[PDB]
C-alpha cells in the first residue's frame, strides 16, 4: 500500500477551493507525511505571485499545489483559473518521487481540478508558463 490517504481537514479545504469566490491568488502547498502515509497541508498563502510560489517550493523534493491565478488578458478582461501543479523535480530521490507519483491521482480527483500540470523543475513555474497552460 503506497497510495496515501488525504487528511480530512485538507480534503475540506480543497473542496472549498474548487468554487471559491475570493479573488486573491491563494496557493495551498501539500506534502506527503511518509510516516502517516498521508497527504497533508504544508502551507497556504492568501495571495502569492507565480515567482513567489516558485521561490517557496523545495528545489529537490516533490510537492502538490493548488493555485488560483488572477489572469489579466491583453484586452483587460480578468479571469481567475485554478490549477493543480505537481512539482516533481528531477534530482528528487526516486523513492520520494514514487510515493508522490502514487498519490497524485487520488489528490487530483479529490481537488476536482481539470487543469493538472506537472513541472520537472521549479524554474518552469513562471507567469508566462501559467498563461500558456491556463488559456484553454
Q: What is the CATH number of the domain that holds 79?
A: 3.40.20.10
Number of domains composing the chain: 1
Provide the grid cell at 77.
478582461
Range of the domain at 24: 1-136
For 20, which DSSP code?
A: -
Cα(106)–Cα(46) distance, integer angstroms: 25
CA terminus-to-terminus distance, the chain = 36
* Rounded alpha-carbon distances, angstroms, from residue 35 to 32, 39, 96, 98, 99: 9, 10, 12, 15, 12
Asked how this structure was determined, the answer is X-ray
> Resolution of this PDB entry, in A?
1.9
Q: What is the dihedral of CA 112, 113, 119, 122, to 10 degrees?
A: -100
Is residue 73 exposed (0-12), middle (13-18) or buried (19+ Cβ within 10 Å)? exposed
Amino acid at each position: 500500500s503506497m497510495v496515501c490517504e488525504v487528511d480530512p481537514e485538507l480534503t475540506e479545504k480543497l473542496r472549498k477551493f474548487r468554487f471559491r469566490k475570493e479573488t486573491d491568488n491563494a496557493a495551498i502547498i501539500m506534502k506527503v507525511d511518509k510516516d502517516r502515509q498521508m497527504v497533508v497541508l504544508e502551507e497556504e498563502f492568501q495571495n502569492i505571485s507565480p515567482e513567489e510560489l516558485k521561490m517557496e517550493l523545495p528545489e529537490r523534493q516533490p510537492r502538490f499545489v493548488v493555485y488560483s491565478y488572477k489572469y489579466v488578458h491583453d484586452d483587460g478582461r480578468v479571469s481567475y483559473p485554478l490549477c493543480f501543479i505537481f512539482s516533481s523535480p528531477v534530482g528528487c530521490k526516486p523513492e520520494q518521487q514514487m510515493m508522490y507519483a502514487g498519490s497524485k491521482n487520488r489528490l487530483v480527483q479529490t481537488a476536482e481540478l481539470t487543469k493538472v500540470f506537472e513541472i520537472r523543475t521549479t524554474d518552469d513555474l513562471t507567469e508566462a508558463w501559467l498563461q500558456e497552460k491556463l488559456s484553454f
